[PDB]
């Protein structure tokens, strides 16, 4: 099987083979046939009476664990713990953002750059704004956001875009969210030996936990990031490994937390550091981003995107990365080993993510700019250790357009609003094109890479099929970066891949057929968008012809995302089977009974063409239900 559809990826894999270094593909091959029990989710290790493995085939072999737990119980608890872990990752990201908001000041390193956005958020949090200092407002907003994480009395605060009907449905179902850390703790408590042994209740607890990710953690992280670093607008950038410069210092930012990457971008324009880069013999400083931190700095500043998850190692294989600065999440620990074969400084900066044999330079949130300058100076000084004979940068990079926040999308939609009719600054043109049938629907393509799928193949095939069927596509994360590398994030792509209705819409609004809405936490924006459409049409989000796809997901964060997208009322297709096939009841809940609960359900489909067909059929049947 081919390892990737990306030519630059293939060239660097040949180079890695020539250099005698191992990749994620090599380790996947070394793992050989993976354990069937773990793959089906019928293995349990929740107590030291175990490990227990029960048969993935009902009626044969061992039926219960030592405590008496069935295959359905073991599967449901394993799934719930994946959701809890994903929720924890996203919530910790949002908590750091809220704490940064709490420390903003007029003369400090972290300021308020979008005051209108802050005032709207303050309105959503019942924070007074009129005749008040902007930083007093910011601190009050940060306090309310922080209380969302750990309040023990009262109800949490949810964005106004969430329909009232969806909230009432959640309350009736028993999944209405509480404080984020409280829900994570509840899931961890109920999976403990001898607690919850009922699959339906376990799945409902996991949905409840995932809601605190989708609508509170990721949402607050995104909106506070907009407040502090600016709301994204349409902006040009370049993507894929070709963005590395042979003659410049190459600094690659990998990870998820945006404050460090924002401070590194600011430090790169420091005159002393630019002079130092010149003095070490480089033309300048070339900042490149990877994964979600790359998505953030690219959405807000046009920083070039070096690559997505399964390309991180190959970035080092070029031999041109002088510094690789990582914060947390989706940072392959093998990088520490791999950087030994090159001059690269692999720099960890977060106390949450220590990696053995990496260079640890703790990013100081109290003095973010000075700390970022010190880290960047280490990366720049490493340019003297470059071995130019080992350098091979593929001449493969692609132009991309991104920055499509909900605000930017609304601004673009204002173009097709007749001034004599109005209203302006709404999602009404999008609702109109969806209701009329010019657009069949909207689909979100999100998720990681996975060695089980030819890298980027499923993302590209799913996106092309959807836009060919007049389904407008919004992309986040590594899927968005796969689209960027391929060339879908271009206005020209409208006439090259889209169907007639979507091509007309793209021409009228002057947008690409695929809209890059940011990082994984920026999936909250998608929720926001859908909610607005629903609120404009007076229906629940489960009545709309919308869907989400995770063609190549790998992370626990992806599991939590799919769970809260389904719980919000949006059908979700998974291109990688989750470890639930061992529990028939869990499969039936996720793919059949969920529709009775929340009006949406999971679809497991490993063939992208079949997934596109199923998405189109499901959207059409929801349209016929809605009468459009």
């Amino acid at each position: 099987k081919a390892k990737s559809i990306d030519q630059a990826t293939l060239q660097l894999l040949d180079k890695a083979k020539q250099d005698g270094v191992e990749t994620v593909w090599d380790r996947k091959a070394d793992m050989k046939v993976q354990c069937g029990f773990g793959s089906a989710g019928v293995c349990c290790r929740n107590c030291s009476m175990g490990p227990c493995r029960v048969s993935p085939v009902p009626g044969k072999g061992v039926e219960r664990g030592i405590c008496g737990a069935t295959a359905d119980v073991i599967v449901s608890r394993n799934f719930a713990r994946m959701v809890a872990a994903g929720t924890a990752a996203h919530s910790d990201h949002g908590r750091s953002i809220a704490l940064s908001l709490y420390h903003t000041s007029k003369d400090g390193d972290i300021k308020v750059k979008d005051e209108n956005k802050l005032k709207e958020v303050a309105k959503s949090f019942n924070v007074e704004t009129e005749g008040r200092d902007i930083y007093d407002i910011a601190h009050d907003v940060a306090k309310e956001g922080l209380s969302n994480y750990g309040k023990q009395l009262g109800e949490v605060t949810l964005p106004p875009s969430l329909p009232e009907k969806r909230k009432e449905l959640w309350r009736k179902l028993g999944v209405y969210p509480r404080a984020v850390d409280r829900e994570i703790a509840a899931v961890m408590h109920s999976t403990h030996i001898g607690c919850n042994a009922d699959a339906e209740a376990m799945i409902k607890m996991s949905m409840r936990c995932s809601l605190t990710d989708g609508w509170m953690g990721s949402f607050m992280g995104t909106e506070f990031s907009d407040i502090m670093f600016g709301t994204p607008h349409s902006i040009d950038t370049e993507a894929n490994l070709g963005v590395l410069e042979k003659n410049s210092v190459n600094v690659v930012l990998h990870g998820h937390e945006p404050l460090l990457s924002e401070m590194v971008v600011e430090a790169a324009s420091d005159p002393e550091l630019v002079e130092l880069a010149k003095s070490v013999g480089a033309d300048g400083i070339n900042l490149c981003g990877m994964c979600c931190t790359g998505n953030e700095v690219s959405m807000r500043h046009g920083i070039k995107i070096a690559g997505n998850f399964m390309q991180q190692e190959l970035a080092v294989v070029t031999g041109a990365v002088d510094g690789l600065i990582v914060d947390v999440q989706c940072i392959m620990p093998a990088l520490a080993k791999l950087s030994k074969s090159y001059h690269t400084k692999f720099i960890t900066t977060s106390p949450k993510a220590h990696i053995t044999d990496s260079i640890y330079m703790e990013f100081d949130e109290e003095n973010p700019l000075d700390s970022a300058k010190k880290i960047l100076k280490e990366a720049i000084l490493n340019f003297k250790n470059r071995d130019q004979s080992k350098v091979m940068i593929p001449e493969l990079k692609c132009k991309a357009i991104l920055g499509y926040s909900v605000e930017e999308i609304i601004n673009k939609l204002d173009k097709v609003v007749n001034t004599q009719i109005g209203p302006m600054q709404t999602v009404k043109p999008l609702a109109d094109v969806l209701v009329s049938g010019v657009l069949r629907g909207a689909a979100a393509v999100v998720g990681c890479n996975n060695p089980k799928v030819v890298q980027d193949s499923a993302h590209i095939e799913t996106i092309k099929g959807l836009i060919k069927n007049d389904v407008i596509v919004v992309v986040t994360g590594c899927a968005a970066q796969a689209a960027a590398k391929y060339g879908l994030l271009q206005k020209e792509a409208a006439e090259k891949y889209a169907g007639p209705g979507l091509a007309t819409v793209c021409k009228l609004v002057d947008i690409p057929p695929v809209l890059h809405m940011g990082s994984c936490v920026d999936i909250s924006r998608i929720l926001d968008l859908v909610g607005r459409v629903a609120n404009l049409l007076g229906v629940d989000m489960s009545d709309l012809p919308v869907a989400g796809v995770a063609p190549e997901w790998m992370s626990e964060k992806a599991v939590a995302i799919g769970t809260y997208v389904v719980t919000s009322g949006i059908d979700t297709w998974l291109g990688v089977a989750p470890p639930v096939t061992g529990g028939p009841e869990v499969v039936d809940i996720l793919t059949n009974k969920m529709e009775d609960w929340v009006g949406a359900k999971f679809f497991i489909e490993t063939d992208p063409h079949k997934a596109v067909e199923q998405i189109v059929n499901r959207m059409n049947e929801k349209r016929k239900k809605l009468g459009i």
Binding site: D432, S436, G437, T504
Partner: protein
């Protein structure tokens, strides 16, 4: 019934009416009997633009229903909707041709029916010059004669060439609107199919001024969209046939504005209840400068 289904239903009704009237023409006059429009050089302009074929006898008119049949594909995608609008336009043209071959004088005053080529050439000079900054296709009935007269005279005072289809003709007559080719208020006919008589104005504008040869349908549609500043104001309740004819106008690149609740399409299908702002809304939608 959604927009696509409404357009498909309208196109099927137009096809049924065309089949009935063609059967009547075949029964009364014979398949060798001549089929023509008064003083034109492009036979039936819509069929000539779509295929390049000139319809000369009744048998060929009966064979032209296959064009309407092949232009109706009931799949909910935008291209099929535009093709279905074009099918309605072809069916309306066939109905008008059958009217002309059945009756010696199908239209009486003030209705003018078909517009001859010399009138098109006369209007071409003020069209490109800018003395005619647009073509207002008014179809249906306004709630009052006063509002219809007000809108029509507002268009007239701005130099636009306004064409009238339906009961709006009677409302304008009650409103003391002075009509004629020099007064730029042209009543086409009381039936919806009479709207084709302004559509052929645009089509022949591509045939005469644009120089596009017959059968180059995409070139004709591009020319009408980028050169002919026409728009539709549909007043009063809209049947499926009216919506299908509006889909044809959209296929020609002409935006359709109405006072009725319809599934809106930005820049193409717009609802404007306020009759005091309909003229400005149409001028903005068609990008017309006075």
């Amino acid at each position: 019934m959604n927009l696509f289904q409404t357009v498909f239903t309208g196109s099927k009704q137009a096809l049924a009416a065309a089949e009935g009237i063609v059967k009547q023409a075949v029964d009364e006059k014979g398949r060798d009997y001549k089929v023509a429009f008064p003083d034109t050089a492009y036979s039936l302009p819509v069929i000539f633009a779509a295929t390049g074929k000139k319809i000369t006898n009744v048998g060929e008119l009966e064979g032209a229903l296959d064009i309407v049949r092949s232009l109706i594909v009931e799949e909910e995608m935008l291209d099929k909707l535009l093709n279905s609008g074009l099918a309605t336009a072809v069916a309306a043209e066939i109905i008008e041709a059958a009217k002309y071959v059945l009756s010696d004088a199908p239209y009486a005053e003030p209705c003018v029916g078909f517009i001859s080529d010399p009138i098109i050439r006369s209007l071409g000079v003020p069209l490109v010059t800018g003395d005619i900054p647009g073509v207002a296709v008014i179809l249906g009935e306004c709630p009052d004669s006063e509002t219809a007269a007000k809108i029509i005279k507002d268009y007239q005072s701005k130099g636009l060439l306004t064409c009238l289809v339906g009961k709006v003709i009677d409302q304008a007559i009650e409103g003391k609107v002075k009509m004629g080719l020099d007064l730029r208020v042209i009543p086409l006919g009381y039936d919806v199919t009479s709207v084709i008589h302004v559509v052929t104005i645009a089509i022949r504008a591509a045939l005469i001024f644009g120089g596009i040869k017959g059968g180059q349908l995409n070139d004709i549609l591009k020319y009408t969209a980028e050169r002919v500043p026409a728009f539709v104001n549909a007043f009063g309740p809209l049947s499926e046939l009216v919506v299908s004819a509006g889909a044809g106008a959209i296929a020609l690149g002409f935006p359709v504005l109405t006072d009725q609740v319809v599934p809106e399409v930005p820049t193409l299908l717009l609802t404007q209840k306020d009759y005091d702002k309909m003229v400005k809304t149409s001028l903005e939608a068609r990008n017309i400068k006075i």
